[PDB]
Amino acid sequence: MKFNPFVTSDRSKNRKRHFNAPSHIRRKIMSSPLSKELRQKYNVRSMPIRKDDEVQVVRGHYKGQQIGKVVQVYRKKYVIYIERVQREKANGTTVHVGIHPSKVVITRLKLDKDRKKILERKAKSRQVGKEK
């Protein structure tokens, strides 16, 4: 249960800070799990997602064992757009299909200087509890 008395366990005060949440926390809410291939090596469980990653799809209609690529994140509807998940309108143009990021597993990353500072800290302060 929660014991801290300055944190709200209500329904509406948790839906409001979600549908009116700013972009720098939309960053954290729109994350996605890593594969067991990366979970073996980095010893990490979840990362925020970037425009140039690689993706399989587990649930939804378009699920399978295929590796797509991210086109562009759309953090206003909590949704992204992928390369080859698209479908046809009336006349023939192709419109992409929105996928929520929690249904999405990552197989390859987009590594930077601002990303390995993070990824080595989410296992440093991961192991301290192992040191219990």
């Binding site: 249960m1 366990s9 329904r11």
Partner: protein, 265 residues
């Protein structure tokens, strides 16, 4: 609030004008211009008896009835019929005043205390709790009363050596203390017979806290137990006894139904 309905300004149109002598809205060029403002039957306007906050919410009950209810809720967590009929799953427990050693206060892992409730064969109750996690009906869903469940077995210890962090996760399990007992978690809803798991250092304390009939309580001020009103409550071994079946009259159990009248002429 006190302001409901009265933050307008109204005055009736009087007689004539083919209306009902009701307070009406003072002019204006809109919809709400002569619509009906005060009263209770209007759209808008106050309710009957605007509920005040100084309704007498709380009650008090005497002391020596609070202690008589505790003695009358402890005396029925010992029969294996008032516990089964309450609803628990107690088909196999080997002894109903279940007293366990004092090394349970040294548990700190809930993993270490499920192996305990498996050995004690009480897990099929917690299994009934997992088999009865469901929603709620009505308008409780939008007032943070979403998920309900079913009340499980109680646990009564003596001193806190680490057991709370090792039991407070299993749903249903309600903890207590002997020094600071409670009724609302001994008699759920108003009914009697919740299953309980005592500890040795507590079950050896009720003789001192509540006292026998010929010895008062030594941690209270002045309190003996209450007195029964009749002893041989079983009138099946009273009535077919040789002292009573002798001094009765004969039992008259012949049915005597009404007779038809035939004509004697």
């Amino acid at each position: 609030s006190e302001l409901a309905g009265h933050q307008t300004s109204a005055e009736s149109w009087g007689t004539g004008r083919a209306v009902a002598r009701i307070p009406r809205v003072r002019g204006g060029g809109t919809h709400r211009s002569g619509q009906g403002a005060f009263g209770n039957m209007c759209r808008g306007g106050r309710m009957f008896a605007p509920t005040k906050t100084w309704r007498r919410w709380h009650r008090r009950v005497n002391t020596t009835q609070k202690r008589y209810a505790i003695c009358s809720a402890l005396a029925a967590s010992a029969l294996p019929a008032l516990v089964m009929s309450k609803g628990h799953r107690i088909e196999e427990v080997p002894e109903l005043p279940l007293v366990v050693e004092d090394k349970v206060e040294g548990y700190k892992k809930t993993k270490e205390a499920v192996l305990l409730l498996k050995k004690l064969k009480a897990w099929n109750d917690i299994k009934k709790v997992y088999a009865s996690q469901r929603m709620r009906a009505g308008k409780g869903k939008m007032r943070n009363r979403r998920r309900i469940q079913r009340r499980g077995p109680c646990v009564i210890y003596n001193e806190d050596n680490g057991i709370v962090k090792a039991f407070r996760n299993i749903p249903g399990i309600t903890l207590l203390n002997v020094t600071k007992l409670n009724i609302l978690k001994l008699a759920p809803g108003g009914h009697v017979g919740r299953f309980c798991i005592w500890t040795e250092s507590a079950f050896r304390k009720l003789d001192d806290l509540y006292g026998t009939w010929r010895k008062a309580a030594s941690l209270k001020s002045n309190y003996n137990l209450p007195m029964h009103k009749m002893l041989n409550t079983d009138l099946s071994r009273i009535l077919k006894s040789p002292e009573i079946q002798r001094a009765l009259r004969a039992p008259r159990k012949k049915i005597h139904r009404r007779v038809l009248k035939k004509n004697p002429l």
